């Protein structure tokens, strides 16, 4: 299965954190990274007076079940980040969000796939569009169409 995962951090110097996370993603059992997007420097969604976030998207090949994948991404978040990643409008030490999981639709207590707000977040959509410009969601929506419809500002690279 190809899972698409969003990475964000707004540590002041986030490259080492983001690399640690990427390495951890690759080390997940029965999984490996297919592709990584460029790293983007994005203005905070929330209070403007925190550092900018580094956002990226990753394609991960996996034979884990979706909730097993989430178990790992949450583990990585605990091991690599702190309860900065939990302040509601930031800062965020490290978030890992499962955007898509194959062509599955998931709505459980633990998981909402496709991700619950990605269609409102250019910082999730643009890096995804870099690595998967032809992406079609399970319901038939097209990533390209969402970006065209909403006109979200293009992102600057880190």
Ligand X SMILES: CC1(C)Nc2nc(N)[nH]c(=O)c2N=C1C(=O)NCC(=O)NCCS(=O)(=O)C[C@H]1O[C@@H](n2cnc3c(N)ncnc32)[C@H](O)[C@@H]1O
Binding mask 11-50 for ligand X (x = CB under 6 A): -------------------------------xxxxx----
Nearest-approach distance from CB 145 to ligand X, in angstroms: 21
97 as an active site residue: the answer is yes
Q: Which two tokens stand for residue 57?
A: 């998207």
Q: Distance (Å, rounded) from C-alpha 157 to C-alpha 136?
A: 25
92 as an active site residue: the answer is yes
Q: How many residues lie near ligand X (CB under 6 A)?
A: 24
- Which residue of 53, 60, 76, 146 would you call a contact of ligand X, by CB under 6 A? 53
In Å, how far are 36, 39, 62, 109, 145 from 33, measured between CA atoms? 7, 15, 9, 27, 26
Torsion from C-alpha of 146, 98, 153, 89, nearest 10 degrees: 130
Supply the DSSP symbol for 118.
Answer: G
Using the contact rule CB under 6 A, the part of the chain among 16-24, 26-34, 109-117, 144-152 near ligand X is: 109-117
82 as an active site residue: the answer is yes
Please report whether residue 115 would count as binding ligand X according to CB under 6 A: yes
- Read out DSSP for 74-109? HHHHHHH--TTTTSTTS--S-EEEEEEETT--EESS
Of 82, 110, 117, 153, which is the active-site residue? 82
Rank residues 92 and 128 by Cβ distance to ligand X and give the closer one.
92
CA 49 to chain centroid: 22
Please report whether residue 2 would count as binding ligand X according to CB under 6 A: no
**Exposure of 9 in the CB half-sphere (CA atoms within 13 A):** 20
Please report whether residue 120 would count as binding ligand X according to CB under 6 A: no
Catalytic residues: 82, 92, 95, 97
Q: Which residues bind ligand X (CB under 6 A)?
A: 8, 42-46, 53, 55, 70, 73-74, 77, 89-90, 92, 95-98, 111-113, 115, 123
């Amino acid at each position: 299965t190809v899972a698409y995962i969003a990475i964000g951090s707004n540590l002041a110097s986030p490259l080492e954190q983001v690399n640690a996370a990427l390495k951890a993603l690759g080390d997940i059992p029965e999984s490996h990274i297919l592709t990584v997007s460029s790293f983007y420097r994005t203005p905070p969604l929330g209070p403007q007076d925190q550092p900018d976030y580094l956002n990226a998207a990753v394609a991960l090949e996996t034979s884990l079940a979706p909730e097993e994948l989430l178990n790992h991404t949450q583990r990585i978040e605990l091991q690599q980040g702190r309860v900065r990643k939990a302040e509601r409008w930031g800062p965020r030490t490290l978030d890992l969000d499962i955007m898509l999981f194959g062509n599955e639709v998931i709505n459980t207590e633990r998981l909402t796939v496709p991700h619950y707000d990605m269609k409102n977040r250019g910082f999730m959509l643009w890096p995804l569009f870099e690595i998967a410009p032809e992406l079609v969601f399970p319901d038939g929506e097209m990533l390209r169409q969402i970006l065209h419809t909403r006109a979200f500002d293009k992102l600057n690279k880190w």
